[PDB]
From a paper:
The COSe from S. meliloti CECT4857 used in this work presents a single L105F mutation with respect to that protein (Genbank Accession No. QAT12853). WT SmeCOSe crystals alone or co-crystallized with choline were grown in 1.0 M Li2SO4, 0.1 M Tris pH 7.0, whereas the HEPES-bound C54S SmeCOSe structure was obtained from crystals obtained using 1.5 M Li2SO4, 0.1 M HEPES pH 7.5; they belonged to space group C121. Whereas the presence of this PTM had already been ascertained, inspection of the catalytic environment of the WT SmeCOSe structure clearly shows densities shaping a hydrated formylglycine (FGly) residue. Based on other studies showing the necessity of high sulfate concentrations to inhibit hydrolytic sulfatases, we used concentrations of sulfate of up to 200 mM to conduct TSA experiments with SmeCOSe, showing a of 0.8°C. On the other hand, only higher concentrations of ammonium sulfate (up to 500 mM) produced a slight decrease (a 15% decrease) in SmeCOSe activity. A sulfate molecule could be modeled into the catalytic center of the WT SmeCOSe structure, most likely arising from the high concentrations of sulfate used in the crystallization conditions (1 M ammonium sulfate). In the four chains modeled in this structure, Asn75 is at a distance between 2.8 and 3.1 Å from the sulfate ion; this residue occupies similar positions to Asn73 in Rhizobium leguminosarum PMH and Arg166 in E. coli AP, with the latter being reported to coordinate the substrate, the intermediate and the products of the reaction. However, our structures do not support this hypothesis, since Lys102 is at a distance of more than 4.0 Å in our sulfate-bound and HEPES-bound structures. Nonetheless, Lys102 is at a binding distance to FGly54 in this structure and might assist during FGly regeneration (see below).
Choline-O-sulfatase (COSe; EC 3.1.6.6) is a member of the alkaline phosphatase (AP) superfamily, and its natural function is to hydrolyze choline-O-sulfate into choline and sulfate. Choline-O-sulfatase (COSe; EC 3.1.6.6) is responsible for the first step of this pathway, consisting of the breakdown of COS into choline. This enzyme belongs to the S1 family of sulfatases (subfamily 12) according to the SulfAtlas database. Like other arylsulfatases and phosphonate monoester hydrolases, SmeCOse is a mononuclear metalloenzyme. DLS experiments performed at pH 8.0 show a single peak in the particle-size distribution by intensity, with a hydrodynamic radius of 5.7 ± 2.1 nm, which corresponds to a globular protein size of 200 kDa, also supporting a tetrameric quaternary arrangement.
Residue numbers in the entry:
A (entry chain A): 5 to 512
B (entry chain C): 5 to 510
C (entry chain B): 5 to 485, 488 to 509
D (entry chain D): 5 to 485, 487 to 510
Write the structure that this text describes.
């Protein structure tokens, strides 16, 4: 059974990984990794928002099934995740970094978690479908990140990711001490970074890499409010766009710092692989690179996520290691597919995970078997007044919301999604295609039931959270475990035995 | 707004409270409390098992709604409980003792919890409908408690309840120091004891009180296996009855220690009343006495709970204090009613709690209003192979399981439930009654959907729990908070100001 | 004096022999040989092309010294080879199979050659540094081997190797009949197979062994032309890469047949060991296993050789038999070291071979003495426009061409050579290392003189070959040499049978 | 394009051809040929020994460039020769007879070779500069040929040359059958005889032609060892001079048989000319007469070659045929010039041969353009302990060896090379001349680098050749080719065969 190192980053636009990292990015370690990887060019989040994407990623289940509709929705501890599936199959499992789990369970199957979460674990960020058009300024996104972009040597997120990286490498070193043990458990370590998520603020060393960058403005620029589709209009309102003057310089500084923070992450990818190499674990380790959702990065005038356009919904996915054929795949894939893919790679039978996952294993695709299943996405959080769903199949993307006109995009003819074929069909094929997707949509979702479930979930939490914020607060944030009385040299141990057990490799 | 003291005990057969405590029980404090209480004689659990009853009790929702089907089912933290409702209305809320909450949330709205739980917080005790007939010896009930009944000066449960009682009285004393503060929050303290739940083992002092007891044998004796209804048969097999030789003396000793432990609790009730009296909080404090489920106590040959017979499904309920007219109420009520009753007593509008509670406030009842709503019960844990549901309305009890013959009892004519009218109707009224109950059951429950929901919950947990018991274990048990650097006299405080703030009355 | 059996194969990627054959290969005979061998994990060709590698192998001399720069360069008969060295010390020496010797001398010291060569002996395959960028389609490598991989029960190469094997085993039987006369010379037999060189076509029996194989794709995928280093770009045009559509199925079928052909060879290794065992010559016989160069096998998008990346430049080397302690050695070694190692094992003095070899004996090192000399490589044939040289020492590989950026790899940190530390050093030590390798390069090669000598050799041959392909062709192909075999009436009929019999 | 017939003989003293053959020689065919020839009176070998001279002759390159330093040195097959140059231009090229090519390549560009070589093809005759003063008796020259001169009707060499002649004439006839087919390639046939090389033994018919010969003793007689220049001393020690009593009679017998064997050869020249005439190819055919090196023939007391004196270093050179103006040329020329002359005569461009030849075409000289380039010679085989070089320019000859005193000769004033002007200069002109030659010598050769290259070549071959003579020997001698395709066979047309093999038709 191979080891599994999952490297995850937050808010990474998948279009920036056309075939591994784009040429213009300074990312040598991720480019070298990509050359060894199966690379999934058209990979999509299951939900363009942090907590919904991450609960779905861990479970291999859609938000409608996990019930994690938004960034404040409880994730039930009884829902199996890839950590349960691997741990049940004999893996040691650990998390360093972020997963935005909401509720008192901050492990969800992970045997050990090395850091707290950067974000809250409580019900604060609960949207309210009963009050459409409101925004909550103290947690909603706003374009202050765009006007505030720049250069700093420490930030909240760099403190977090610096520590995530250090503890991940320390854990790989600790795990190598078991390498000569016949009865060692294989390990699965998830390293989950908060970059390149905003604030768009970067260390000067990485900012300086992009002085001459040719990609600091999007090809598709700002669409005025009057000309936006309704959901995009709700996002602009939710971001308080009217109270910010986003200049071209602001767009350029934000994209520049974002690219710089990819380069910041690339250095951390190199450290992890160097640790794997020197500990002699690289040949037995699968490495997956993934992200929860994208960032529009100013394309269409939009920033951040919360929508199904390519920049928000596309996220990179790469897998490398024993038994994995390197190569590029264009068939659309989903983050929903990661958990069943990991289970398959770990030797777990299809039947053991079939009842618990909505995705499919990608391993047959890596081995030349055509994948046919469509890619499904959902969104039911801020800037929605009712749930949205999307279907990505073949060359098409279809988006449905009961409150909006449908969208239908031919991504091979129209990769920038500039012509809505549901409004302006090119011919009778486009009209027949729209009908097929409507049928597919009715097959997969009951939208009235979806809306009612989201409303009931919000209403529960508004009662409960108001109560929990009265009197003394009981926090749910993960506190990594204290072990000082059992670490290093203590006088209930054999002193020379200790040094030998903590040294690795041995006898050289 | 009044203070609220909830006194809860575990596994207390409600037939023992015909009008407050039965005369033969040595329970002067509970009898004194009962005389000033609204007493609900025919009060029922929502589910005859610890965790399902308690989650349903806290939320005012049935197990089919809480999803807490058994003793290992996760109780979601987003479900509102009476703690949340009161806390949202401005109450300080606290729990001392047991609530058998499963999952990493061990507060469920309680602002403070003073003890850990006596029982596990994890998914270990999960039944499996895919293996009907199996029992799990390491946690299932078994009749060893009947054959091992006796006397001891300390037990696991007396250690627990002794501590529950001390910390509750300590908290009342601490709360009295705020009495003179016009800006104080009113308080709601739940004090939840594990007795008289088995093992049936009592301190000598209380065991000696029942030397001449005349209720040491049940009136309805052991029904042989072949004559038992199918569910009772499933219970006997789950208790491993074949491997125990339960003598008449075992029955008497179990019941004697059980009664003694009611007397053990009565002493603790008096302590709490005494603390309320001397702190001058009694007259502003509502007092509720309740239990999660009953105990058959050998009636029909059965022990413990897990069924809808009277000894297992009946639990006492009493309410006393400001605005509560004393009196005995015979109309059937249930534990589902406690949470909306609490909200009502605390001045919370019916509209604020309507979407979150399946029961009804008993306040109107206390003030003379006739109550008509029926009482519903559910069971879907060990010794069931498919869910069971019950309906209690007027003089009738109806019990349904897809796999079993229906049961229908006229508790007015047949309070010991010896004649099943669904099998042996007395006439056309009994037949029409059965039909009315079938139609009403079919409108309230889809029992096939109920069964599918229970099986999914079990299967989920069997995957998850096996994983969580591999490698290092992460416990969810509640750990009461440690505040020693901020307690008593510390040198960041004014040392004479401290003594005055900690003194009361002043 | 021990007998010496040299088993050589063609185009075998040394990364497939990490400690003997890799576990995933079906090769029980080579795994059993390895277990009693000194095994040289990091052994390198001296030049990643057939004839340059083989002339250098035979002489223990680099191409810059043999002058065999490419696959059409004459190998002078006056250059001593290990066959001369052993033959001078009293050995009977013979070759069965391929050595790709160019020119009229097809023995180069071998007393007897049992087969012709599979490949040409003339100046046809001559490159020309005056036309940098051309390709010659009728003999250049091309990716048709990759798109044409598969299964067949006979091929040109299997016909050849079947015969190589038969005659080698026949010769071992013949050599066993002299095994009772103390007056008999020790023997050195070189058995040189053309597999696993492409075509990637295998017998179905061996193809079937790899249905479940987990290694049918390389560890590094195809790198687009624009992202390749300049020499890799030259190679990619060389094989006309743009005129082939290499699918993943093509990659898988090519690697599967290649592994199948390793298994095909393993059966022949087992046959040779069986003959040694049954004739009772095994215990007195040194066995060496070697190859001329590797095969990239689709790694980086490259096939075949002509470069210094691991898959092309690494080749296996194992030695077993009397006086050889088994073990795995990680210090880099060279095919250049085979000839002085053979001479040393044969009791020849160091001074007798010192003037004629650029490598070193590996025997001290089998016996625990640390080997410090670096490993040197050269390439000056097709897809080069000027000579390339490489140095392998410690954990490092350094590659220099006057026309290209340097390459520097740390193979312990970067075994797949995905980070060029000359362009992208990690820190100060990488810079100091690059400088030291530049100093070492200057101490070993005059690159201007190298290029001039290559150009003069190419130009000579272009004049000569045009002339030689006018009029009647005189072939140089070796023809092995009936009226003296078996029972003939000028011999003693009864005495003959007892002489042909053994034991 | 003209046909080309190269008639080559071995060890013919060039002073015997002062204007074609000397008057006293019975050589009517070679004198008839000479009269229609451009004749190069002062023509020199490139190296006074068989294999080195011949490899240099074939390549138009000096030994230091061919690497063929001695009679056992491998001649690499990748070195272009006039055979390659002509073959590349469309010629059929063939050799009948000797060329003393060493190594497994016995064609060196020739498309067909009609005989094997009379001498070995392997590394046997290798000198060793590490053993100066030693001699290897089983192949070194010795003066036994001088004492054993005489008369016989067959010899090894006459068997050989008889066969060379027969097959060469047979081949000319075969080539004439292609005359009427205007599609045929032009041909170049090299006919290379072993005479007048020793043994000095002749058929009685030719021996009787010199009964009254007046040139049976050399003008310059024997020089005693103690008065010889150091190289001549090394030659005498290597010929084992101390073990032979060479009488005046021995000299006369040797020189008589030698002249007789020139007459033996002249008969064969007549045969070739007669075949060309009767086949009607004569007018379209260039005829070149040449030799590899000379023979001292007793002059100065020396025999054979291995030195730069006139008798060993001069060889005849004549060219006749279409476009060749007859006449005598005195400017010094070199065997190095044959290959570029042949190429020029075949219409090959100057630039196609310039990188490959150290000599110059003689066609401009034939056509009245003065030639100025000097004549260079080298020697690095037996009787040398380090390489020797020589320069021949205008009237002068300069000889250098690092180990010996220089020699400088004014061949106009001193045609017999009796006065060494480097030791006994006549005045400042001789001194400035010597200095000019020193400077010239130093610009052309690094003699230490030359010595090192020779030593390495010797040392290589000592390792190899010992090996090759253990166990079964594999020979490199040329074996000429097919009887099942000759004459009348029952897959051909019988009436078609006779007509195609008949000529004239
Ligand atoms: Mg995110
Ligand atoms: Mg209970
Ligand atoms: Mg090869
Ligand atoms: Mg000669």
């Amino acid at each position: 059974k191979p080891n599994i190192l999952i490297i995850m980053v937050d808010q990474l636009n998948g279009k920036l990984f056309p075939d591994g990292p784009a040429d213009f990015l300074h990312a040598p370690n991720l480019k070298a990794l990509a050359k060894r990887s199966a690379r999934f060019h058209n990979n999509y989040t299951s939900s363009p928002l942090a907590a919904p994407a991450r609960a779905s990623f861990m479970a291999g289940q859609l938000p409608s099934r996990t019930r994690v509709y938004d960034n404040a929705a409880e994730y039930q501890s009884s829902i199996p995740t890839y950590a349960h599936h691997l741990r049940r199959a004999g893996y040691y499992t650990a998390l360093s970094g972020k997963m935005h789990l909401v509720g008192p369970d901050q492990l969800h199957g992970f045997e050990e978690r090395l850091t707290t979460d950067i974000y809250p674990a409580d019900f604060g960020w609960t949207p309210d479908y009963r009050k459409p058009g409101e925004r909550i300024d103290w947690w909603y996104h706003n374009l202050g990140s765009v006007t505030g972009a720049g250069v700093a040597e420490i930030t909240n997120q760099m403190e977090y990711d610096d520590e995530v990286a250090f503890l991940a490498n320390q854990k790989l070193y600790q795990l190598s001490r078991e390498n000569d043990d016949e009865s060692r458990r294989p390990w699965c370590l998830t390293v989950s970074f908060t970059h390149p998520h905003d604030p768009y603020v970067a260390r000067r060393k990485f900012w300086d890499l992009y002085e001459d960058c040719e990609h600091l403005t999007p090809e598709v620029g700002a669409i005025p409010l009057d000309e936006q589709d309704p959901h995009s209009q709700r996002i602009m309102l939710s971001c308080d766009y009217q109270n910010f003057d986003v200049t071209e310089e602001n767009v350029r500084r934000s994209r520049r710092a974002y690219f710089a923070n990819i380069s910041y992450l690339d250095e951390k990818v190199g450290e992890l692989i160097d640790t794997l190499t020197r500990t002699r674990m690289l040949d037995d380790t699968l490495i997956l690179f993934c992200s929860d959702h994208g960032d529009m990065l100013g394309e269409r005038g939009l920033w951040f996520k919360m929508n199904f356009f390519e920049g928000s919904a596309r996220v990179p996915l790469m897998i490398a290691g024993p038994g994995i054929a390197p190569g590029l795949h264009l068939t659309p894939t989903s983050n929903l597919d990661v958990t069943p893919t990991l289970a398959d790679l770990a030797g777990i039978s299809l039947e053991e995970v079939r009842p618990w996952t909505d995705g499919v294993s990608l391993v047959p695709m890596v081995n030349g078997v055509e994948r046919t299943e469509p890619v499904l996405m959902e969104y039911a959080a801020e800037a929605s007044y009712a749930p949205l769903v999307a279907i990505r199949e073949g060359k098409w993307k279809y988006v449905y919301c009961a409150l909006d006109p449908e969208q239908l995009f031919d991504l091979e003819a129209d990769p920038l999604e500039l012509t809505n074929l549901a409004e302006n069909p090119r011919g009778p094929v486009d009209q027949a295609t729209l009908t097929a997707f409507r049928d597919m949509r009715a097959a997969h979702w009951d939208m009235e039931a979806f809306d009612a479930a989201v409303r009931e979930s919000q209403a529960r939490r508004w009662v409960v959270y108001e109560a929990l914020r009265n009197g003394a607060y009981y926090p749910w944030d993960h506190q990594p475990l204290q072990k000082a009385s059992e670490r290093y040299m203590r006088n209930h141990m054999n002193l020379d035995t200790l040094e030998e057990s903590k040294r690795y490799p041995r006898g050289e």
